[PDB]
């Protein structure tokens, strides 16, 4: 009767979203620098 063990091993199949979802998704969109996607043309330099 594996139809249960094989049908139960699937429990982790979708749970794969729950984990990534967790509470605050372990990632409150930190961004850090996503807005200004223009990271300048490597022309940094400064004085």
């Amino acid at each position: 009767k594996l139809l249960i063990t094989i049908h139960d091993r699937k429990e982790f199949a979708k749970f794969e979203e729950e984990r990534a979802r967790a509470k605050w998704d372990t990632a409150n969109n930190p961004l850090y620098k996503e807005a200004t996607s223009t990271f300048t043309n490597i022309t940094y330099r400064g004085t």
Binding site: L3, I4, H7
Partner: peptide
Amino acid sequence: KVGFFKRNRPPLEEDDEEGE
């Protein structure tokens, strides 16, 4: 056939499957 009907139908309709 077993847990399938008794795993996703109970939280909604205690039906089997074909009848959803």
